[PDB]
């Protein structure tokens, strides 16, 4: 299991980034990057799962998630 980085996204138009939703979901307890809108694990050993983040997004909005492996930990 490797570290993932995720955004909350709209379940409509292409699924655009929903930054405030991502921010809410990210504090999981990771850190949020304003420019690219991803939530990342604070440490490689301190990762959250793509599944956990999905639940997080859904607690705050009707949102889906885009997740990918985080390059800084690959």
């Amino acid at each position: 299991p490797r570290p993932v980085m995720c955004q909350c996204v709209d379940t409509t138009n292409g699924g655009v980034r929903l930054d405030a939703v991502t921010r809410a979901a990210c504090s999981i307890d990771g850190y949020y990057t304003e420019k690219d809108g991803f939530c990342r694990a604070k440490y490689s050993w301190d990762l959250f799962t793509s599944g956990q983040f999905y639940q997080a997004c859904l607690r705050y909005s009707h949102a889906g998630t885009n997740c990918q492996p985080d390059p800084q930990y690959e």
Binding site: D10, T11, A20, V21, A24, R59, Y60, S61, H62, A63
Partner: protein
């Protein structure tokens, strides 16, 4: 009355919550984040997951639900 409402959820005038677009499902985590400690004079009914207030804080609360890509429902009390 702000004291009765914030203190006891009594004599509130409005009861509002965030709703998921499309489904209209209630989103208690989003409501919570816009209530209680987070909104002066408000009362957070953690059970029903709704936000109550005496002063008309509907517009402010709306900006929170809306910031999270949600809608808002309110009942008059």
């Amino acid at each position: 009355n702000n004291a009765f409402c914030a203190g006891f959820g009594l004599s509130c005038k409005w009861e509002c919550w965030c709703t998921a677009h499309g489904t209209g499902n209630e989103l208690r985590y989003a409501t919570a984040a816009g209530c209680g400690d987070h909104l002066s004079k408000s009362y957070y009914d953690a059970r029903a997951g709704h936000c109550l207030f005496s002063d008309d804080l509907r517009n402010q609360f709306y900006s929170h639900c809306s910031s999270l890509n949600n809608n808002m429902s309110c009942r008059s009390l």
